[PDB]
Each structure stands twice: as C-alpha cells, then as structure tokens.
Amino acid sequence: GSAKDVKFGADARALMLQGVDLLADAVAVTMGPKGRTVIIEQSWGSPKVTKDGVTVAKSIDLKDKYKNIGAKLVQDVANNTNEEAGDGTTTATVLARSIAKEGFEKISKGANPVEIRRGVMLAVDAVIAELKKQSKPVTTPEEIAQVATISANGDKEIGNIISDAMKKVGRKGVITVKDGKTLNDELEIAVLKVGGTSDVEVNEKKDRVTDALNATRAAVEEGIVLGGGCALLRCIPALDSLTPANEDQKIGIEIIKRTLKIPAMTIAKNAGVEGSLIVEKIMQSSSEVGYDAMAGDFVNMVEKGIIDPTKVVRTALLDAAGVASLLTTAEVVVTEIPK
Amino acid sequence: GSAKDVKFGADARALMLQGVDLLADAVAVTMGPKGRTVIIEQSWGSPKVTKDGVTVAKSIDLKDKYKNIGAKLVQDVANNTNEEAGDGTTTATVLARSIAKEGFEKISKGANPVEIRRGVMLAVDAVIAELKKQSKPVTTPEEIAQVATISANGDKEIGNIISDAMKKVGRKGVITVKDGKTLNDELEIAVLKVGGTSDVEVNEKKDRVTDALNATRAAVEEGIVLGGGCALLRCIPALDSLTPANEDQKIGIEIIKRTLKIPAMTIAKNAGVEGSLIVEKIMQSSSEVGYDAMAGDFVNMVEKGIIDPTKVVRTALLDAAGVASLLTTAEVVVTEIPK
Amino acid sequence: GSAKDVKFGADARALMLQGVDLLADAVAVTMGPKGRTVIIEQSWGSPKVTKDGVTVAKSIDLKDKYKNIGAKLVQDVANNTNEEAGDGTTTATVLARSIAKEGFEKISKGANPVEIRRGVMLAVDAVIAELKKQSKPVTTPEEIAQVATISANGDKEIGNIISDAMKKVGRKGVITVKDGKTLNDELEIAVLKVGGTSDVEVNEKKDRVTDALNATRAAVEEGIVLGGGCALLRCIPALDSLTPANEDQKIGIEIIKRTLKIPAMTIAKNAGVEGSLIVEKIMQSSSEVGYDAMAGDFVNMVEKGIIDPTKVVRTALLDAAGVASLLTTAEVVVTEIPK
Amino acid sequence: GSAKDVKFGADARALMLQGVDLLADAVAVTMGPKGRTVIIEQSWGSPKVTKDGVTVAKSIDLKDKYKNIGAKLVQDVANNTNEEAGDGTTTATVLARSIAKEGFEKISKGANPVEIRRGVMLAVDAVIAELKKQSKPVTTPEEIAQVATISANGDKEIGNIISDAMKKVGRKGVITVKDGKTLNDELEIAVLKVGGTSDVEVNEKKDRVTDALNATRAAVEEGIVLGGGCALLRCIPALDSLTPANEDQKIGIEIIKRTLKIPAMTIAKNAGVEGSLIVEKIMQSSSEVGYDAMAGDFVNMVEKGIIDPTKVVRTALLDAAGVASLLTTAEVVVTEIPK
Amino acid sequence: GSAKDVKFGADARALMLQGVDLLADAVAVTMGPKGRTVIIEQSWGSPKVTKDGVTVAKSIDLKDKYKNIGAKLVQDVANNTNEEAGDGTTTATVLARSIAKEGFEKISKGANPVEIRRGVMLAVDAVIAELKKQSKPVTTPEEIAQVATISANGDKEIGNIISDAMKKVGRKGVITVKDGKTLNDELEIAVLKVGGTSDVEVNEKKDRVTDALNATRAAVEEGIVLGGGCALLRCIPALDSLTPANEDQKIGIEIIKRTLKIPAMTIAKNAGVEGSLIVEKIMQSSSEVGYDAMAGDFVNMVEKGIIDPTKVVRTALLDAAGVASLLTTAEVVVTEIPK
Ligand SMILES: Nc1ncnc2c1ncn2[C@@H]1O[C@H](COP(=O)(O)OP(=O)(O)O)[C@@H](O)[C@H]1O
Ligand SMILES: Nc1ncnc2c1ncn2[C@@H]1O[C@H](COP(=O)(O)OP(=O)(O)O)[C@@H](O)[C@H]1O
Ligand SMILES: Nc1ncnc2c1ncn2[C@@H]1O[C@H](COP(=O)(O)OP(=O)(O)O)[C@@H](O)[C@H]1O
Ligand SMILES: Nc1ncnc2c1ncn2[C@@H]1O[C@H](COP(=O)(O)OP(=O)(O)O)[C@@H](O)[C@H]1O
Ligand SMILES: Nc1ncnc2c1ncn2[C@@H]1O[C@H](COP(=O)(O)OP(=O)(O)O)[C@@H](O)[C@H]1O
Ligand SMILES: [K+]
Ligand SMILES: [K+]
Ligand SMILES: [K+]
Ligand SMILES: [K+]
Ligand SMILES: [K+]
Ligand SMILES: [Mg+2]
Ligand SMILES: [Mg+2]
Ligand SMILES: [Mg+2]
Ligand SMILES: [Mg+2]
Ligand SMILES: [Mg+2]
C-alpha cells in the first residue's frame, strides 16, 4: 500500500554494510577482558551501563532504512545467540559482521552468492565438527569456577559464589539471580543476591552473573574448549583439508577461513595491541598455547583457566554464519518511504 | 468526486512502462538457478529475504500514479500466476513486461491495438496447444524428485523429502509445510518441518519448499516439458505456421514470437552470460538439447533433470499475455490528484 | 454562506468549454471499432480498463471550478444517455461537446441564445422524426446477432451467445451477465458467464456484453438504422427543408446541421483517416452506402451488418442537444472559493 | 524502535563531562557555611529557595541527551546519598564530579578503565576503613547540639531545639518536622514547628532542620569525625600505604587520592579563599587542627564543634565513587533522536 | 559620522574583560620552559608556528567590538613591551590581564578608579625600586651564556653561540640573525645563520635566537635578577611597607600585590603543577631559592642559571600596569555599528 523505495546492486549493499558496521563497531568495544562499557539512555529513568553484546545491539535503531535493515539483521544474530546460549553475543556479532563484509566484497557479475552461501555452510559444519572433536568434559568444580570467572569478566568472587551454589544444590540444580539490598553478593538455599551501591552497578553485575551462570550451564551440559578465540583458530586446518566443488564454494570456504581469526583479533584490539601479530604468533605456537590479554602474554590457557563452553562458540558461529550468508545473497532492497 | 489528472497518448504509456520496467527489473534478478534474493523491509519486525517473484512484486508500490498503475498491473499478473499455479511468477512477470514493452513500442496512428491484442491471443493459444503437444506425463518417482529439486533452486534434500512424502502418503496425499524447531528438515506422517537457525532462513526455505510442492503437484496433475525456458522456445515454429488476418494481428503474432525468447535470455543473463547467444545456440541445437546455467553448458535437459510442469508455463504465459495485451490498448490514463 | 467567485461573459464560457473539451477528448478516443481503451486508477485496488463512454466520463473530475462545471454537465449528458438507453454514451458526449462549442462560438451582443436553443430543439425534433421515418424493425435473429456484434466492438462470439440466449428464452426473456470462473464465455438457462484470465479482462468483457444486451434490447423494442453515424448523416436534408422563424433559430438549425456530421468524423478519426473526406464521400454516395472503418472501405451497411438501434441514437442526440443548448445560454458563472 | 544516535570515544565522554560539570557547578555553590542558595522555579506557584544538594540536583534536566545522561548519573549519586544518609548530598556530588573528571582524563588506548574502577573501589574501601578507625562515639548531649548546629548551617537555635527534643523523648525517640503558624520555632511532646514569615523561608528552614535531624540521627547511630572535609583529608596516608596490583589500579588509587582533597577545597572556595593553600596547610598541620571557614582561621575542630557523622561522609564517598567509577568505563553512548 | 553603539557600566567591562581573557589565554600557553606553541594561519603561504607572546597577541583580532577593544589594549601592552625590551611580552600580557581583572572586579558605586590607578602607579614604582635594589651586574661570560640559554627556551647551543659572538666582537658588538641554508647554526665575523629543515622551524628558531640576543643585551645593559618570576615575588614586602593615602590607593596596592604572583603561577601551571602551592613554598623559602619547572624542583636559581634581565621584567611590569590601570577606569564604551 504505502509507497516503496527500491535500491539495486552495490549501493544497497554498501548502505546495509554501513549499518552493520555501525552496530558491530558499537558492540565490539565490549569484547574480551579489556573491553569497555556502553551507556544506553533509558526513556523513563536513569541510563543503563552494560557490557553485554545483545543488550547493546538491541538498543541501536537507525533512521536510514537500509542501514536499519542491516542493523536489524545483526540484532537478529545477537538475539538468536542470546536465546540459544545465553552468552557469546558479541562474538556472534563480530563474526556476522566479518562474514557479511567478506561476502559483500566478493560479489561480481559472474559470481553466484547462493553457492558461496552453500560453501559457507559446509565450512561452518566442518568447523563445528572440529570444535566437537576438540572439546573436553567438565570433571572438576575448579573448571566450573574458571568458566564462571572467565564469563564474569574475570571476577573471582562471582565464580566462587557460582561454584558454591553448584556444590550446594547440585550441578543441575535451580539457580536464580535477584538484586540485593546489601553491599556484597550473598547466596541462599539457590538464590544469588547481587551487591552494590546504585541500581546501575547492580544491573551491570547482574548481567555479568547471568552470563556466568548461562556459560557454566552450557559448559556442564557440553564440553570445554580454549578461550580467547583460540578454539576457533585451531579449526583452520579442518577447512584446509576440505575440497571445494566449484569456485563459489571455494570463495565461501575462504570467507569462513578468514572470519575464523576475527574474535582473537578483536580481543587483542580491545587490549591495545596488534591483533594480527597476536593471531599469527598463536597459530605458529603450540595447540595448548594461547594469548592472555589481561596479563598480555602467551601462556597455557587450560592451566591459566582461560576456557570457554563449546556450545557457546558453536552456536555463535552457526547463527552468525547463517544469517550473514543469507544476507550476502542480496541484489535488491525494498524499503518504505520515510514519511 | 476528488480532482483527477488526465494524461493522453505516449506520455502516459511511457510512465506506465517505466513503472512496469522498475517492478520487473526488481523481480527478474531472482530468476533461474543463479538468481539472487531480495530483502523487503518489514514494518513490525526483522526484514524478509525472498527469492519469490510474487512476494517481491506484491511488496513494490510506487509514489507516481502512472508508474503505480503499471506496477499494479504487473502485480496482478504475478498474483494470478501464483494463485492458479503456485509457481512461475517470475516467468509471468518477465513475459508480461516484454509483451507490454513490445506492444507499447508498436503503437502508431494507423495501428489498431485491439486487433494486435486479438493476434496476441491467437498466438498464445497456438503456443499453448504446442506445449500440450510437447508434454509427457510423470511415470517415475525420480521425475518427481527432479521436478521438486528444480523448483527448489536445485536443492537435492528438498526433492528427496518431497519424493519420500509422495511415496508414503501417495501422489495425491495431503502434504503441508510447518516451520521446524531443529536445524534440519524432517518428515512426519504428511507434515514437513523446515530446518534453520533464524526466522529469515526458515522463511526462505519454506517459500522454496512450498514452490517445490506446488510445482510437483502441477507436474503430477499435468505433463512435463523441458526446463530453462526451452519449452517456450520450441513453440516458435508453431507461430511461424500461423497466418495473420491483417497487419495488426501480424504485429501481435510477432510480439508473441519475440516474447517467447525472454525467459531463457533472463535465465542466461542472471548466470552472467549473454542471453542472445545462448538462445540462438539452443534454437540451432536439437530439440532435446538445452542450456544448464548451473553447469554453464549445453546438455540434454531430460537426462540432467531440468524439467518444468507444463501447467506452470502455460498459465504464466496465458496470464502475462492477457494482462499485458489489455494494457497495450491504452490511450488515456486518469489518476487521482496526489493530495 | 461560503464566499463565491463570479465570472462574466466569454471568460467563463472559455473555461467551461476547456473543461468540456478535456472530458470529451478523453471520452472520444474510445469511439468506433478502432477505438482505444482508458485506464482509470481505482483507489482500493487494481486499475480499471474500460472502453465505455459513461465510465470514462464519470471518472473525470477537474480541480478548476468552471472546467469542473463543464465536465459535470457532460457527465450529466453521458449518464442520462446511459440510463435511458444503456448504450451510445460516447456519441452523446461528442454531440454535446460539438453543440456546446458551436453555441459558444456563435454568441454575440445582439444574438439571443434562448432563441438559438429553441431552434436547436426544433432541428432535433425534425431529425428525430426523420430517424423514425428511416427505421426498419428487426425480423430475423441474424439482425439481432449483427446488432450484438456491432455493439460488442465486433465480437462474433458475444453476438452468437446473445442470439442463442434470445432463441432459448425468447426475445423479451430475462437475460443477465455474471462473471465467469472459466476461460471462455458460457450460457445457462438466461445467465451469461464471462471468460477471461484476470479481473480487468472480465470487467472489460462484461461491460461490452452489457452494452450489447442493452443495444439489442433497444433494437428489438424499436427499429434499426444504419451504423457508423450514417443514419445521423442522412437527416441533413430534413434540416434543409425546415425554415427558420428568425436569425437565432437559423443559427441553431445550422448548429445542429454541423453537429450531425460529428459521430462519423469521430469514428473515421479513430481509424486513422481523414473524417471530413469520409463524410463528404458518404454524403455524395447512395443512401445504402456507408463507411466500414474496420475494413476501411465504402460498403453497404445493411449487407455488412453495420446497423444501430434507432432508440440509442435518438436518445443520445436528444440528451446531448438539450443539455448543450441549455449550456450555451450562460452569461454568468458563480462558483465556490477554492478553500 | 525509535531512531538512535550513537557517539564513540572521547566526544561522548566530553559531552557527559560537560553535563556533569554543569550540574555539579550548580550544586557546589551551596557547600559549607559560606554557601549561597539556589532558586528553582516552581510550575504551580512561587519559586523555591534551597541550599540542599539533592534538591538542586534533582531539579536540573538538560536538553542535550549526553549532558542529560551525565546529569542523570549525578542525580543518581545525590539521590542515593540522600536516601541512605539524609545528609551529605553536596559532598557526594562534588566527589562524583571529581572522580568522573579524573577518570575521563586518564583514559588512553592502552589503559583499562575496568581495572581503574577496581583500584578505585580498593582505595575507597581503605579510606572507609580509616574513617571507621578515626571515629569516636557521641557521649554527651553537647556533641549532639554541635552536630545539629553544624548540619543546620551554623544555627544555634536549631541545635538547641533538637538537643531539647532528644533530652525529652530520648536519643532514639520519634521526632518529626511540621510547618509552624508562628514567627519562631517551637517544640511539642516530639514535633517541631518551624517559624517564619513566608512559605519560602519556612521551607528553607524546614529543609535545614530535616538535614540537622538526619545528621544527628546518623551521628548517634555511629561515630563522629572532624568536619570541614578534614576527616577525608586524614585518610591520604592510608592510600599511601596501599600497594597497587598493576598500572590501572595505581591510576585508580591516585584518582581517589586526588579526589579526597575536593570537599575541603570546595568549602574553602565558597568562603572566598584559595582552597589549595588551605588544604596544604591543613595537611601540614596537626591531626586535630582544621580550618574554620566561618571564622576563617585554623582552629581545633573538636573544641570548636566542627564535627560530622562518619556515616554521612562514608556513604557519600562510597556512592560517589561507585557511580563515577562505573561512568568512567564508558566508550560508546547511545541516545534517542531528539524528535 | 557613522552610527555608534554606546554601552554603559559593567556590561561593557565584562565584554572587554572577555576579550582580554581570550587574548591572554591564547598568549599564556607559551610561557615558561614547559610552554607549547601557537600556529597562526598565514594568508599567503604556510602557517607560522611561534612561541612568542607579541607574535601571538598581534595575530588575534576579534569580531565583537568590545572584545576587540580589550584585545587591542592587550596588543598595545605586548607591542610596547616588545619594542622597549625585545623580550618579556608574555609576562607583560599576563600581568596586564591580571591587573585588568582585579581592577574590574573591585569597581563599586563609591569606588574611585582614578585613585585606584594612582595607587597602582605608586605600588609599581615601589616594586621597580625594589627590583633595581635586587639587581646584580653581569661580570662573567658564563652569566651571558645562562641568560641566553634561559631566554632561548633552555637551548644550550644558542647560548654558546651568543657567548662566542660576544667574545669575538665584544660585549657591545653588532650581532644580527640571518636564516641559514644548512642544518646547523653557524657564526661568522657577527652574523648568525640558523639551521633547520623547513621554513617554519628556522623561523621559530630565529625568533628564539632574537629573543635571546635582546635579553642578553638587556642583561649586559642592566643588572640580573632571579628567574621563574621569583624576582617579582620578592617585592611583596616592599608593598607591605608602603602605606596608603586612602581606601582606593589601598585597593590599587593590593591589586598590584596580588598581581605580583601571576608570572610564577603561570609558569608552574604550564608545567602541569599547582601554581598556588609552588608560589607559597617559594615565598616561605629562602631568598635565593626558586622553582625550576624543567627539573620540577626547588633549587638555587643563580647556581642553576635561572636568571632574567632586570630591564625586561621592569618594563613588562611598568607597561602592563600602566595600560591595565588606565583600562580599569572605564565606565562608557563607544563603538561603531557593525555594518
Ligand atoms: N584473560 C583473558 N585472556 C584472553 N581472552 C579472554 C580472557 N578472558 C576472556 N577472554 C575471552 O573473551 C571472550 C569473552 O568476551 P565477552 O565480552 O564475554 O563476549 P561474549 O559476551 O560474546 O562472549 C571469551 O570468548 C574468552 O575466550
Ligand atoms: N540448472 C538449471 N539450468 C537451467 N535452467 C534452470 C535450472 N534450474 C532451473 N532452471 C529454470 O529456471 C526456472 C526457475 O526460475 P524461478 O526462480 O523458479 O522462477 P519462477 O518462480 O517464475 O518459476 C525454471 O523455469 C527452470 O526451467
Ligand atoms: N465496422 C464498423 N464500421 C463503421 N462503423 C462502426 C463499425 N462498428 C461500429 N461502428 C459504429 O461505431 C459506433 C459504436 O461506438 P461505441 O464505442 O459503441 O460508442 P457508444 O458507446 O457511444 O455507442 C456505432 O454507432 C456504430 O455505428
Ligand atoms: N564553620 C565551619 N567551618 C568549616 N567547615 C564547616 C563549617 N560548618 C560546616 N562545615 C563543613 O561543611 C559541610 C556541610 O556542607 P553542606 O552544605 O551540609 O553539604 P552536604 O549537604 O553535602 O553535607 C560539612 O561537611 C562540614 O564539615
Ligand atoms: N628552567 C626554568 N625553570 C623555571 N623558570 C624558568 C625556566 N626557564 C625559564 N623560566 C622563566 O620563564 C620565563 C620565560 O618565559 P617566556 O616564554 O620567555 O615569556 P616572555 O617571552 O614573556 O619572557 C622567564 O621569566 C624565566 O624566569
Ligand atoms: K561483551
Ligand atoms: K524467482
Ligand atoms: K465507447
Ligand atoms: K548544601
Ligand atoms: K612566550
Ligand atoms: Mg561472556
Ligand atoms: Mg520456481
Ligand atoms: Mg456501444
Ligand atoms: Mg548538611
Ligand atoms: Mg623570553
């Protein structure tokens, strides 16, 4: 009914990529241990300070229709990752942005983006198989504490509290988080009360505790892989083994291969160092060796406790790859007229 | 009641042709195996990515009144083709655009567009008779699988699932598509669950599965002709045999004869090659020989499985020809004032 | 109550004649066998393509108040002709435009437009008497078929269907038209189902079938005269016989005499030839000889079947003449201020 | 849903710092004995004249979205300090502004604001421990009178009335303030009636009496420290003893160390003298020696009666530090479009 | 002739003070060893980078008429100081700004600014007498080297070159500066060639060499006092000894007494430390002890070589005080209308 504006070819792709880049640049400043926070103005009260990828993504709406379409697709990526895992939304956002950019710049007159998407799906399936091959189950409560601490932005006390809750009520016991009226966090028999002074602080801490609980639930329901994005880096040889069916599938496989390095470079970049050199030295190093951004040095991640649930990284990669690959098949964009 | 703007002669025809060209150019980028997708912004939620001709056509509304009139007529073509067949909307759209363009360009002071329309109807009846003469019934389930795969953008798994459903519940059994909550497609006794990661992917896959089911229902209800637009190409000698009654009917017959080459040229164009040379080599080739765009070579279509239901192409040609021929008879266009 | 704008003399007449000319030029492109169609944008859905004079006239509303007054008067002419006959609206529109133009052009300081209107009424009464003298009753079903075919824009099948209906249910039997769900027209016992592919096509065909039914009902309720506007051309000697009472009545008689040639010239003009030469050759020819526009040659009207009901032409001439003659008497025009 | 504006890096930090500086500069003109008042226009009646920090803070709302975000955060600081103590809102506001300013000015590419916030929390915990170590309980009613007088802007009669009320109904007795209909303050058995001539005067006096009652309740529920900001100045050696864990924690500790001098400097500034010299001479002086701004000379605070509840200063420092340190971690600010 | 705008009272004073503050804030960032540079856009070529006070002052012209009047007066101060000394323009600018500010702030209905100006003149005469009493003549070439190095922004090579030139051509010999075509500075028999790479660098170095030569010429023509603004700080007791004749002269004497501390505070402020504490510790210290900003510690000025010509400081103080005191007598300002 309403009048529509139709955009063709690389112009619409460029506008959507600008929107995706804006949303992903806003989200990616909160990734890793040395990541900052984002203040979102709240209409009815005090602003909200958050380090969560999905919370930042869902709060960004753009005036331009095509940039808003791209932003909405990235929000879909982040929301799907949040609902199916509870953690890993920033990683999914950066992976989706990388895949979308790689697919957009590789579109030519003779290229077939549908077969590129197919090759992306096969590459992601291979990477997921490698990740499942590289997982190790959680056998000790210390691993649970390490996972909770890593997912709580390196907070020892949150991990200790979650480990105590899992010891008290069992590994599969019901655990919930409710805001506390005191300065410190406490545990009741499980119910977690979050300490703080203002509502913004308790909300940020509650978001981090919820992320830690979701991540440790995923880590106990599935295996454990290395942290820092190195688990995704170790799957490049799996893609090297695969053979393409045609040129477009080769393009998609190379897109996924280039994207697999993105989380580690983002984590290093937030730490103030050069991500490319860090990733190159990680790949040249041994399989057990990774990069600690908080300490800023190459260590053994299992010993240091830098580990991630394999479910979180698996679902983040899958959602980001699927949505971005579907996006790259675009040729025409139809939007409503901005009345 | 409301004030009206009245436009005469070739100016209104040019404006309506511009609207038709815009809508058809938006639609035609999704035709054939190497066709891209279209993102349509949704008012209430995430945008919709589709490769369906009728879905793209129905979502385009223009501000200019005359361009909107042309777009509405092309939307009528696409909607009628979708309702009476369930597939072939893009072919009907491109055929309607071609017929409208040729009819508009052949209008002179002494020309009679009504007799041109009559000649167009005679030519289309002859082509439909030839298509019915060239059909072959479906006798093996492998033909059903080939038809479903071709109508599902070359997806082997969709064709296999539909063939399994037809084996289990019979050729005339009740089959429906419902969105799945898992990663892969599954069959229940028939009900199809569509796999995916996000809603956009499952919606696109559901649209393709519905297209495949409608096309295979048409293919079992009627005969089978060659794919790739070659079946419509083989009917040119039938038009050569026909004799006109006057000059206007000859003009209409030549309009239909030139339009018959449009689908194959569009399919080749989406593949990144020159449509004219492909169509010429197809016409010089044997009757069984057609052009495979995915493989990009001249093959035997029945052996390779590039086949189409004759009902789909028949109704697409009929609807497009009727509506476009009625359009070409225009001399005056009356629209409402854009208050 | 509301503020009014008052216009005097030839300026208001010129504006009103501009409005009348616009509406009549829009309507007259659909007159005769070689007439085109008009697309009218519909607010709630798809546009409507029509060849009907009254349908085109009723859909034109002008922003300018005086042009809209003229257009409204021409719409009155067309609607009265449609209601009292069911056919002949385009002929009435062109006759009304011609009479209004000649009446406006012949107004001077000493001229009396009321006596000119009186002379117009006497001339039209004489022409109607001549038309009644020249009529011949319908005695054979072939005449019914010819009348239906002529009134259905030369469609043989519509005339055959209507003749079959009149044979089945009698000449005065109840016959109605309802839209069909199939490709071809069919008859039930009388109910007519109209075939087609899209709603626009069935609507145009329904309008033509309704026109044919109304025209054949008029032709069976009254006599038959020659088609192509020749019947109105044959009444000029009747006006030559008449003697005026004063100068103004002579002016009116000459206005009607010049207007009597309008329909044939319009039919020839839509055929792409010179109307003046065709009318002159018809007048120099024999009484039985007329001009076939579809064949583009001078033939015998009765033998070829180009015949019209006398009631349709009689009422079209009467309505057009009355309204236009009343129109030409204007000196002052009062309109509302365009707030 | 609504369109959002996203600002990155130091620009958003500068805008929020401008908003914070505006609100804190408005608030800080009312600190100390030589502080002025603020008139806030009331929509429904006469304006309100107040010397209360939270009342001034809550009444300032800025049009610019980022400045409004900063102002809202400072309002959160002031409101939390008012709710948890009843007094010390101006001190909390100035401390929060100072901490936010130093945190913003120390942000670099390699700096980690989260670890800076951690160091700030450690330093504040150390300062709170020192304040608890330096407290002395209230043992005499003269101390209650001194605390009430200090918190009532040096009003002897308010302190005398509150001391009489505490003698009559006990230290923990229920005491409330109600506006009086007479010129002078009176006490009933406890209910305080505030004297005055106009509603503005009685409102200002009621605000000061409520502040005095809350402060003396805190002073009787906890210990007593030196006034004039000297108690917060005496805790710098406690920070000197502390050792950092890394560079960012050292930055945070130095931020808190520099902030600890803010209240005394502001009190001196409102008195028309140089705050830096006063603070330096206070630090060089003995522990019991502080600066009397009303007398404008260095005296013994306990003997002169310049004392503060330790709870008020403790909670003001804690709230200001927490909220400001959370603010300094900002990198991206998302606001609504000013429609 | 041209229309005039007249401003009365404190509004014009505030506008002129804003202009003076703008110019002085621009100039004062280049004072002391830790002073930055100023880039002034040149109309005909590359911009000019300078650390010279008069060069920055003369390049600032304001659009507002009253601010431009204040800026023009400060430019007069700087130009007179440059012409009569060759050095000390920044000190004169900051002294003039301080005197103007205190004079403007101390104007009341009963105050007499003319007698305040008189008291300022007596105070400045007393300070000049103290400066002449505290001077010591140059007896060694090492003192010449120290003076040249101090006036050349601590450049050892410039001081060495100037000392060599004075050894070669005598203490009163003719010495000039000409731009060099080589990378390093050289001396010919005296002519100084300034090294560098581009014109901006050689221009900045030439300005510093000219400043050093003018300062050492003044230092040999007159005595030597302590650097860092300590020489002006040591004259406060001389003002303490003076007795006023009335209240306005006391106000002027206190204005000069407060202004005498400005250069040292500015030098400390440019070094990133608190000027008030540095000045207080300098005044509490011994007469020979001053503050080295480059080393950032309290040292012996004569031994370290931080010395200034007494003529430069004397003329800077005299010019600044005279012009600013004349300015403070303002009551009415008349400007031209900005056509
Ligand atoms: N100390 C550390 N050194 C290196 N990498 C780390 C460290 N702590 C966490 N990480 C990595 O940073 C990621 C956490 O980023 P986060 O902000 O939680 O993004 P998301 O919410 O998308 O998981 C984890 O994948 C983890 O591997
Ligand atoms: N591999 C192939 N090679 C050549 N032509 C193909 C191939 N696959 C499908 N086609 C042709 O492309 C058409 C399908 O286009 P499609 O996007 O479904 O348009 P529509 O929806 O109008 O049918 C079919 O008519 C088929 O003949
Ligand atoms: N083949 C023909 N040759 C010449 N005149 C024709 C022919 N067919 C129809 N006509 C004339 O054209 C007229 C029909 O015009 P039409 O579009 O029906 O206008 P209206 O609706 O006002 O009758 C009839 O009066 C008839 O005499
Ligand atoms: N005579 C005085 N000399 C020095 N400091 C004082 C004097 N009276 C009060 N103060 C200080 O001023 C502060 C009171 O400021 P106030 O306006 O109450 O701010 P707040 O409402 O935030 O406490 C107290 O902390 C007290 O230490
Ligand atoms: N190392 C130093 N430590 C302290 N003061 C210094 C040092 N070097 C120079 N100064 C002081 O800084 C002043 C030089 O400032 P400058 O930029 O030359 O201003 P101006 O051009 O007005 O003299 C001198 O008066 C000198 O006393
Ligand atoms: K994050
Ligand atoms: K399609
Ligand atoms: K007509
Ligand atoms: K206050
Ligand atoms: K300088
Ligand atoms: Mg996380
Ligand atoms: Mg299809
Ligand atoms: Mg008709
Ligand atoms: Mg108080
Ligand atoms: Mg100098």
Short mmCIF file of C-alpha atoms in Angstrom, two decimals, chain B residues 1-6 8 13 16 65 68-69 72-73 76 80 84 107-115 117-118 121 248 318-319 321-323 326-327 329-336, chain C residues 22 25-27 29 33-43 45-47 49 51 56 58-63 152-155 183 197-201 204 269-273 294:
data_model
loop_
_atom_site.label_atom_id
_atom_site.label_comp_id
_atom_site.label_asym_id
_atom_site.label_seq_id
_atom_site.Cartn_x
_atom_site.Cartn_y
_atom_site.Cartn_z
CA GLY B 1 -15.51 13.47 -6.51
CA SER B 2 -11.80 14.06 -5.96
CA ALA B 3 -9.88 16.03 -8.58
CA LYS B 4 -8.40 13.90 -11.36
CA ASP B 5 -5.32 14.23 -13.55
CA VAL B 6 -5.74 13.03 -17.14
CA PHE B 8 -3.00 11.33 -23.09
CA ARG B 13 2.32 4.91 -21.85
CA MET B 16 3.37 3.14 -17.07
CA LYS B 65 0.35 7.35 -10.01
CA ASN B 68 1.98 2.67 -9.73
CA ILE B 69 -0.75 1.72 -12.23
CA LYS B 72 -0.28 -2.80 -10.01
CA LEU B 73 -0.97 -4.48 -13.35
CA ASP B 76 -2.00 -8.65 -10.87
CA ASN B 80 -2.88 -14.58 -10.78
CA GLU B 84 -3.63 -20.57 -10.43
CA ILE B 107 1.60 1.76 -31.45
CA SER B 108 1.12 4.25 -34.30
CA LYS B 109 -1.65 6.48 -35.60
CA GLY B 110 -2.92 3.81 -38.00
CA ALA B 111 -2.26 0.81 -35.77
CA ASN B 112 -5.20 -0.87 -34.04
CA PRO B 113 -4.14 -2.17 -30.60
CA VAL B 114 -7.37 -4.16 -30.22
CA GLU B 115 -6.57 -6.29 -33.27
CA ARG B 117 -4.39 -7.94 -28.78
CA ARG B 118 -6.54 -10.37 -30.78
CA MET B 121 -4.42 -14.15 -28.01
CA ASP B 248 -2.30 -5.74 -36.61
CA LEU B 318 -1.59 -17.02 -20.57
CA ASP B 319 -1.90 -14.60 -17.64
CA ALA B 321 -0.15 -12.24 -22.30
CA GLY B 322 -3.74 -11.43 -21.41
CA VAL B 323 -2.97 -8.68 -18.94
CA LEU B 326 -5.08 -5.48 -22.40
CA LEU B 327 -2.59 -2.90 -21.13
CA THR B 329 -4.61 -0.91 -25.77
CA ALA B 330 -4.34 2.18 -23.55
CA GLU B 331 -4.69 5.73 -24.87
CA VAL B 332 -5.82 7.82 -21.87
CA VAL B 333 -4.94 7.38 -18.19
CA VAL B 334 -6.96 9.00 -15.38
CA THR B 335 -5.46 9.17 -11.89
CA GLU B 336 -6.26 10.91 -8.62
CA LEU C 22 -10.97 17.88 -21.90
CA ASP C 25 -11.33 14.39 -25.74
CA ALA C 26 -10.79 11.76 -23.05
CA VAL C 27 -14.09 10.06 -23.94
CA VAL C 29 -10.73 8.10 -28.07
CA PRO C 33 -14.34 -0.18 -33.94
CA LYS C 34 -10.80 1.26 -33.99
CA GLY C 35 -11.07 2.91 -30.57
CA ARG C 36 -8.59 2.50 -27.74
CA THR C 37 -9.26 1.99 -24.03
CA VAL C 38 -8.85 4.15 -20.93
CA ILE C 39 -7.23 3.11 -17.65
CA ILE C 40 -8.79 4.67 -14.54
CA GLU C 41 -6.92 4.28 -11.27
CA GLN C 42 -9.06 2.64 -8.59
CA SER C 43 -8.48 3.81 -5.02
CA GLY C 45 -7.28 -1.90 -5.78
CA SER C 46 -6.23 -2.64 -9.32
CA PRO C 47 -6.94 -0.06 -12.06
CA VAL C 49 -9.55 -0.62 -18.15
CA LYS C 51 -13.93 1.40 -23.44
CA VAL C 56 -14.71 7.33 -18.58
CA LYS C 58 -17.96 9.73 -14.64
CA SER C 59 -14.33 9.18 -13.57
CA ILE C 60 -13.07 12.65 -14.58
CA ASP C 61 -13.32 15.45 -12.01
CA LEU C 62 -11.40 18.69 -12.51
CA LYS C 63 -9.86 20.97 -9.91
CA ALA C 152 -19.75 -5.61 -28.65
CA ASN C 153 -16.88 -3.99 -30.60
CA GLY C 154 -17.17 -6.50 -33.43
CA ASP C 155 -17.04 -9.67 -31.32
CA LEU C 183 -11.53 -19.12 -19.63
CA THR C 197 -7.81 -14.65 -17.07
CA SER C 198 -7.73 -11.52 -14.89
CA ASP C 199 -10.43 -9.38 -13.31
CA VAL C 200 -9.66 -6.43 -15.59
CA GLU C 201 -10.27 -8.53 -18.71
CA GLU C 204 -13.99 -5.04 -19.84
CA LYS C 269 -10.60 9.86 -36.95
CA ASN C 270 -10.17 6.98 -34.50
CA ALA C 271 -9.47 4.79 -37.56
CA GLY C 272 -6.51 6.96 -38.58
CA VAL C 273 -8.10 8.53 -41.67
CA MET C 294 -12.60 -1.92 -39.65
#
